[PDB]
């Protein structure tokens, strides 16, 4: 390797004539005390106001706990409701004002996605971002969650993620989210392209392009090394809990009744994140099959994408990679889910 401190090796060149199998082991050695970038993405609905109340305790209670696990801690903030076209929101003017005046809370126009605070180590800027924050809403119950998760993922110089950091994305909601083909009720039929579209920290394709699919979302969370934690309050925790097999590398935590465990939710999910090491291969060459086997430090032999749990640091998880060839006619990259460094395998 000689560059990567976590995955070794970093570059192996394999020459194959077909009908022959090659074989190598790749060690994953976790670090202790990563730098951590935690970006909150909060549902701005009126039901979420006790939860934005409890975001006040982030700079006091959470940042003290995360010093015992991390070496840096930078906080960001974002806000989503839903796409701002009908039938999602109400396009009638005084129905909005009746709807704002009902909640006896400060309200603002609903929005697709507004990036509020970049990643910073000032907790007094996080407390500015919370007390400035107001309420919005749509009419139907699902929200524009996955649409804002992709904009908080691909926009790197706007969110301000660090390459050399453990990137966490706490999604914070209580309803479900719209899917890629809910958009046809609004006549939104051009598919989500997957590029960054923040003009002035406001997502400006929120009424033209559609919601992402789960495959569109998951390929952007893994390419951008972003670890997603869902903090879901009501009965829809079980919805996001059942999408976790479709979204590899996502953790789901249930906010309790009085939201008393928000600071515990980030601590416990960050513990489960460095404890689990699994891999996946991006194969863009034809005629080449990979076959990766996970050897746990427990000794239990699991598949490669299943990975090994209960991993601490000073453990070196081994992935016995076997590659074959079927026919003749470029490189493949085998990377662990949630790490900044990859492994480049030339053919």
């Amino acid at each position, epitope marked *: 390797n000689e560059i990567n401190t976590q995955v070794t090796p970093g570059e192996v060149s394999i020459q194959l004539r077909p009908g022959a199998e090659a074989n190598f082991m790749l060690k994953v050695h976790p670090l202790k005390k990563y730098p951590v970038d935690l970006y909150y993405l909060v549902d701005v609905s009126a039901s979420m106001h006790n939860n934005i109340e409890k975001l006040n*305790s982030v700079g006091n209670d959470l940042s003290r706990k995360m010093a015992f696990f991390s070496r840096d801690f930078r906080l960001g903030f974002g806000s989503y409701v839903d796409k701002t076209v009908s039938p999602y929101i109400s396009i009638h003017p005084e129905r909005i004002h009746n709807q704002c*005046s009902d909640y006896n809370l*400060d309200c603002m126009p609903p929005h697709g996605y507004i990036h509020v605070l970049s990643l910073t180590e000032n907790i007094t800027e996080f*407390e500015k971002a919370v007390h400035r924050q107001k309420i919005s809403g749509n009419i139907d119950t699902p929200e524009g969650g996955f649409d804002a998760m992709l904009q908080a993922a691909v926009c790197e110089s706007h969110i301000g993620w660090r390459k050399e950091a453990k990137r966490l994305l706490l999604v914070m909601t209580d309803q479900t989210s719209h899917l890629a083909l809910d958009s046809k009720l609004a006549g939104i039929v051009v598919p989500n392209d997957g590029n960054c579209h923040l003009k002035n920290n406001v997502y400006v394709k929120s009424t033209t392009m559609e919601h992402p699919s789960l495959g569109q979302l998951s390929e952007k969370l893994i390419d951008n090394n972003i670890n997603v934690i869902f903090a879901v309050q009501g009965k829809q925790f079980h919805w996001y809990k059942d999408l976790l097999p479709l979204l590899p590398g996502t953790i789901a935590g249930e906010i309790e009744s009085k939201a008393a465990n928000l600071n515990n939710l980030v601590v416990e999910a960050y513990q489960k994140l460095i404890s689990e090491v699994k891999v996946q291969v991006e194969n863009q060459v034809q005629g080449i099959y990979f076959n990766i086997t996970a050897i746990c430090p427990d000794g239990s032999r699991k598949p490669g994408m299943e990975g090994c749990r209960n991993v601490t640091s000073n453990d070196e998880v081994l992935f016995n990679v076997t590659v074959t060839m079927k026919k003749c006619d470029n490189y493949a990259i085998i990377k662990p889910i949630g790490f900044n460094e990859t492994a480049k395998i030339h053919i």
Partner: antibody
Amino acid sequence: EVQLVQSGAEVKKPGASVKVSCKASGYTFTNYGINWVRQAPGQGLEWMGYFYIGNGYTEYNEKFKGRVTMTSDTSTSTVYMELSSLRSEDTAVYYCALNYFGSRKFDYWGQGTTVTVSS
Amino acid sequence: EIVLTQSPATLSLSPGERATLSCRASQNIITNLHWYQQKPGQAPRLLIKYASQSISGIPARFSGSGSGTDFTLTISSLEPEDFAVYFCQQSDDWPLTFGQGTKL
């Protein structure tokens, strides 16, 4: 209900300071913030600042910036405001206003305190 | 800074009549406006929250309407105790601001 009780009336020469009290009582649920507002004699109400009780987080007015400081006492639930570098144009009656989180309207006010300045 | 301009400055009426008090804004506050009553010698007392909701314990001649920029406060039968100075209060953004008041 919530009774906000302040300190007594004050008088203080220019270039000094004054520390007014506002003891929250009644129903305190820790999600509130105590404001202060200035009513100069024969002029409208004037926003000075905000102090959230959960964090100790402050929000100030830019006209008053560098002259106003708000601290608190947790066990007695008494929140303090300290104006410094007083001038003769700061002569007014000071109220303390209580919110709850998210709704920045002034639900409770209490009595006033009268600050006089010159000589 | 959201400047709240309130008109008229003073408003001389008779007991039993109906009074209207306008209040404009510098930008859109979407029913983020509250109304206060201040008798002389007392603290301001909130009358209407979020431009149309009635505070409990207040006699329902005080009813407001408006949104965005231009909001109003309407007294049905101008009782003799209603004569005070009335204030607007923007709650849309920091700094919190007031209007200058309308004597009555």
